[PDB]
Structure 1
Amino acid sequence: QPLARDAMAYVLAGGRGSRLKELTDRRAKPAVYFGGKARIIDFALSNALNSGIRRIGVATQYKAHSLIRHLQRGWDFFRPERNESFDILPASWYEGTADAVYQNIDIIEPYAPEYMVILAGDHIYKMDYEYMLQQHVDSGADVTIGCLEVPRMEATGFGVMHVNEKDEIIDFIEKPADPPGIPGNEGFALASMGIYVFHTKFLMEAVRRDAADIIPYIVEHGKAVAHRFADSCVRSDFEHEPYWRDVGTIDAYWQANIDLTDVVPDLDIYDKSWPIWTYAEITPPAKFVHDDEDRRGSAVSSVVSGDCIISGAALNRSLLFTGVRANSYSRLENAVVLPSVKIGRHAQLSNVVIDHGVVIPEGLIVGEDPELDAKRFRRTESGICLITQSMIDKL
């Protein structure tokens, strides 16, 4: 009996993405657009669905308006008569991650799932959660915790799990200077994905027995085991390794998107085997016009969504979301361009993330003058400008 039939996925989607700065000023991190493909939250949601988990809850917190609208419009196909449910819970004040689940016990117990699968909604990755449920029951564990096997140095910006010979967890440190290594495989550490499988009876206990803090109390006073991302990752034939991304900074967000322009991308957005569902509208095709001595609308080494009209504009190494209008004599290079952006004639922009809906003035130049760029816009140390409508308005 597939254990997924009896599980509920509970998605924590209050993450602010503080380090994305003005990208997350009027939206939560899980609402952030990714890949010309989806919003970040759709990865976790899609994994649950693809894994056979048909009961999903999503707890929101900060600036959730657009996230909730997205869920309402995109994730609307679950029917309770078929033992399917999708609950949007702005329960999660809020006060904590644990409280996000606690305060909606009265939504959970009616469904009576045998298993809870707690998921962070702010990471991009694909995983078949049935593996982790089978480990969780077979192992007799109180909690199974999803983990990345990363080099000890890279584990420094992570909650890290110190394990023993058979993967049982003996301690946990937040951001360790010298991350405890894996026994017999030192120089790799086991970092926390913030993915926790429980028995539901147990967790209601844990939540209503310590609610009115932290559940690594289980580590010390109980039985926590570790599940490795590599044991249940989903990989397409065109992905050379298990893909996971945090896109925690403007650099990392830019990079993950622009990497999709590669000839052989790390993430395969063309894969059908483990599909990412999202909110999408019927959209006309992308259009390229003008082929002149002075202007040519085309794209090279780029990803272009539908309803994009590239009119005498030159795009190189760029990713455009739906709705973009790029106008004559403009040029984009190394640009990640969110939906519905307009690029005026003669504008030239390089190494930018352009926010949703921004109208870029005729003639604007970005990525020529680093000093002017840092005055007008959010510039990273690496040279990426994040451009919003409010930065454009005060020029």
Structure 2
Amino acid sequence: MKALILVGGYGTRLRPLTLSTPKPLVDFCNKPILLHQVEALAAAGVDHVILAVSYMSQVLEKEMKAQEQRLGIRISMSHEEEPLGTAGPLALARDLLSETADPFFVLNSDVICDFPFQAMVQFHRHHGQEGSILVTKVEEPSKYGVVVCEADTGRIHRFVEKPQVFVSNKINAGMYILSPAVLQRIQLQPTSIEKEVFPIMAKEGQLYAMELQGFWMDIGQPKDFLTGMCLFLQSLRQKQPERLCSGPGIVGNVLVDPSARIGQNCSIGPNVSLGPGVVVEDGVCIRRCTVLRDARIRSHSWLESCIVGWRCRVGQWVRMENVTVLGEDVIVNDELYLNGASVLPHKSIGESVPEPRIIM
């Protein structure tokens, strides 16, 4: 049993992180999201995964070929020149998914959740048709495409792409299991699967919907990165509570790498990830922020709801609030205020940014 991962290129959202390394290679709770997905996928028992990339990503082939030898499952490498979309990647890796008539996982990279792989296999064997789709609950139907499910069967009736009508609560979760006949329906042109291929299958009624328990987040956006951060630390607190670092100046769910250093007399608040090799100085308050690797946060700073990129240097007495994202190698001078500043990589900030704008 095989599994395709969609990890083509350039996540548009969260652009200051995607400009430096690819979107599946950014560090989500001190680990890339692709390592989370292939880690759970080898926990499922999938033999070999296949990864479909349009962007040339030599650092990603380096990481995945080290990870292929690290974990014990093989990794084949679907390579594309022109952006092939989301359906086209199944049709390039076509003959290999045609080699065995057995249902295969199809996964989006930007979703982090608690993966029910074998329960989804068991649902797909229990319903016995072509495609199985994973759906979740949200609180805001006016953002994502709603799907309507029948009770006790989970069959699709209609796939609706726009909101504001309220025919259904449930939302695409980005996990599919597909049969090879679905792949026979997919052509090599760059078209999207969820835009047309899932719509005719829903018009045939071929898809069925399986529901999750909870803890789902697409983290393709930076505010969605921070909410999925918050929910992943809550799920780690409730599954492996010895892995979060606890202490006297530590509040809530805090996960700290062993390479990370935390200074004397500072209160690190709830729902934070500190990357490997970060240096926190004295008097620094960190709440709901994600600090990626080798980023030094100097003394007496205050930081709320932010993404500090790799090898940054925020000075002393900087205030940082409202989901500002720093790119790689961003130096922030002393005594500055950042609110909504999406700062591009290799920038030096000496102004305060009172209002949300992009610094380049």
Same fold (TM over 0.5): yes
1:157 is matched with 143
Q: 1:366 aligns with which of 316, 319, 324?
A: 319
Q: 1:368 and 1:223 mapped to 2: Cα distance?
A: 46
Deviations 1:118-174 (A, max 9, x none): 1111111122222222322332311111111345xx233222222335322121121
- SS of the residue corresponding to residue 346 of structure 2 reads helix
Contact 1:30–1:41 (CA under 8 A) maintained in structure 2: yes
User: 1:386 Cα deviation (Å)?
Assistant: 5.2
1:337 is matched with 291
2:335 is matched with none
Structure 1 residue 193 corresponds to structure 2 residue 173: yes
What amino acid does structure 2 have at the position aligned with 1:114? D
Deviations 1:184-216 (A, max 9, x none): xxxxx221112221222x133112598895212
Q: 1:22 aligns with which of 3, 16, 23?
A: 16
Q: 2:160 aligns with which of 162, 173, 177?
A: 173
Relative to 1, partners in 2 of residues 1:149 and 1:326: Cα closer, same or farther, differing over 3 Å? Answer: closer
1:3 is matched with none
Relative to 1, partners in 2 of residues 1:383 and 1:256: Cα closer, same or farther, differing over 3 Å? Answer: farther
Q: 1:392 and 1:369 mapped to 2: Cα distance?
A: 20
Q: 2:212 aligns with which of 223, 229, 233?
A: 229
Deviations 1:54-113 (A, max 9, x none): 22111123474444333233342466xxxx421232337132211111112244445x25
**How high is the TM-score relative to the length of structure 1?**
0.71
Structure 1 residue 143 corresponds to structure 2 residue 131: yes
- Aligned CA RMSD, in angstroms, stands at 3.6
Structure 1 residue 86 corresponds to structure 2 residue 70: no
Q: 2:127 and 2:215 mapped to 1: Cα distance?
A: 26
Which 10-residue stretch deviates more, 335-344 or 63-72?
Answer: 63-72
Q: 2:76 and 2:127 mapped to 1: Cα distance?
A: 30
What amino acid does structure 2 have at the position aligned with 1:169? I
Relative to 1, partners in 2 of residues 1:57 and 1:92: Cα closer, same or farther, differing over 3 Å? Answer: farther
Contact 2:321–2:339 (CA under 8 A) maintained in structure 1: no
- SS of the residue corresponding to residue 157 of structure 1 reads coil
Q: Unaligned 5+ residue runs, structure 1?
A: 1-6, 182-188, 231-241, 274-285, 289-296
Which 10-residue stretch deviates more, 61-70 or 214-223?
Answer: 61-70
Relative to 1, partners in 2 of residues 1:61 and 1:313: Cα closer, same or farther, differing over 3 Å? Answer: farther
Relative to 1, partners in 2 of residues 1:336 and 1:384: Cα closer, same or farther, differing over 3 Å? Answer: farther
- SS of the residue corresponding to residue 209 of structure 2 reads strand
Q: How does 1:31-110 map to 2 (within 5 A)?
A: 31-36=25-30, 38-62=31-55, 64-77=57-70, 84-91=73-80, 93-110=82-99
Relative to 1, partners in 2 of residues 1:254 and 1:133: Cα closer, same or farther, differing over 3 Å? Answer: closer
Deviations 1:239-273 (A, max 9, x none): xxx2111224322323443566xxxx522168469
Which 10-residue stretch deviates more, 163-172 or 310-319?
Answer: 310-319
Contact 1:313–1:326 (CA under 8 A) maintained in structure 2: no
Relative to 1, partners in 2 of residues 1:258 and 1:162: Cα closer, same or farther, differing over 3 Å? Answer: closer
What amino acid does structure 1 have at the position aligned with 2:21? R
User: 1:364 Cα deviation (Å)?
Assistant: 5.2
Contact 1:354–1:387 (CA under 8 A) maintained in structure 2: no
Deviations 1:289-312 (A, max 9, x none): xxxxxxxx9655543211122344
Q: 1:63 and 1:190 mapped to 2: Cα distance?
A: 35
- SS of the residue corresponding to residue 22 of structure 1 reads helix
Q: 2:129 and 2:103 mapped to 1: Cα distance?
A: 12
1:184 is matched with none
Q: Count residues with an aligned counterpart.
A: 327
Q: 1:336 and 1:94 mapped to 2: Cα distance?
A: 30
1:235 is matched with none
Q: How does 1:178-327 map to 2 (within 5 A)?
A: 178-181=165-168, 189-200=169-180, 202-208=181-187, 214-215=196-197, 216-230=199-213, 242-257=214-229, 265-268=233-236, 271=239, 299-301=250-252, 302-312=254-264, 314-317=266-269, 318-327=272-281
Relative to 1, partners in 2 of residues 1:76 and 1:269: Cα closer, same or farther, differing over 3 Å? Answer: farther
Q: 2:75 and 2:44 mapped to 1: Cα distance?
A: 15
- SS of the residue corresponding to residue 348 of structure 2 reads helix
Q: 1:130 aligns with which of 118, 125, 143?
A: 118
Over alpha carbons, which structure has the higher Rg? 1
- SS of the residue corresponding to residue 367 of structure 1 reads strand
Q: 1:12 aligns with which of 6, 13, 26?
A: 6
Relative to 1, partners in 2 of residues 1:308 and 1:23: Cα closer, same or farther, differing over 3 Å? Answer: same
